[PDB]
Amino acid sequence: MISRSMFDQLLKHRNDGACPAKGFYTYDAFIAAAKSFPSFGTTGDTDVRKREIAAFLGQTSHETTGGWPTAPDGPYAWGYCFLKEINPSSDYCDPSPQYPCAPGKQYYGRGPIQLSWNYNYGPCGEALGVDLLNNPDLVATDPVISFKTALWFWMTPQSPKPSCHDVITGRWTPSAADRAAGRVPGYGVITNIINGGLECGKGPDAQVEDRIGFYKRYCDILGVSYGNNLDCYNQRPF
């Protein structure tokens, strides 16, 4: 587990006035959230535990980045700047008898994984013990819940698609079809899990490069190797 000083060095600009999420993403909220998922950051040897935190913070930093190319400390120091999706194009409501949209509510991206859609807020809240279908705004008002939604995503498989956790800790072994699709363990298949439909299997991509930039900077500061297969440029989406 990373210390407060390390967390603050990785996420160095999140509390700048420039960032809408200033003050929200506290180290204490991160540690409290992680307690609900005790295998997070505790699975594997010392390098794997650090790498899991780097990979989780890298991907979520991309989803919340306020960086730009000439920014102080570079663009990979501007993770966790945003809390809420900027200019959402809809309510993100896909009505469902299992997940019915609450009146007046919107399911645009919120928190470190930019949780989106009623049918993601629904099962996430159920797993956390919180009604996020009916109060989705909790993901942008309660920082412990906010971090918990991102850890829920990270830790929950959509079998046969694996959890990000299982990939980075070595607990996922690709099926033969996965191998035929180019999906092998590494940060690249984590990008594929998170947004592969739009970002993977099509050559270089500025979004993927941003995810990797954060991960590399965090691995550098934590003192761990990146692992192999960092991109998904040659992977079929799941």
Residue numbers in the entry: 0 to 237
Please quote the paper that reports this structure.
GH19 chitinase hydrolyzes the glycosidic bonds of chitin, namely beta-1, 4-linked N-acetyl-D-glucosamine. One of the physiological roles of chitinase is to defend plants against pathogenic fungi by degrading chitin, a major component of the cell wall of many fungi. We demonstrate that this remote loop directly accesses the fungal cell wall, and surprisingly, it needs to adopt a defined structure supported by long-range intramolecular interactions to perform its function.
After we confirmed that the tree topology did not change based on the presence/absence of loop regions in the MSA, we used the tree based on the unmodified MSA and selected five ancestral nodes where InDels of the loop regions occurred, designated Anc1 to Anc5 based on the presence/absence of loop regions in the extant sequences. Crystal structures of Anc4 and Anc5 solved to 1.13 Å and 1.57 Å, respectively. Overall, the backbone structures of Anc4 and Anc5 were nearly identical (RMSD of Cα = 0.478 Å) and the orientation of catalytic residues is similar, suggesting that loop I and II addition/removal did not cause major structural disruptions. All five ancestral proteins showed a similar level of chitinase activity to the two modern GH19 chitinases, while Anc5 also exhibited antifungal activity. However, removing loop II from Anc5 decreased its antifungal activity by 12-fold while removing loop I did not influence its antifungal activity (roughly 1.02-fold increase). By fluorescence microscope experiments, we observed that only Anc5 and Anc5ΔLoop I bound to the surface of fungal hyphae.
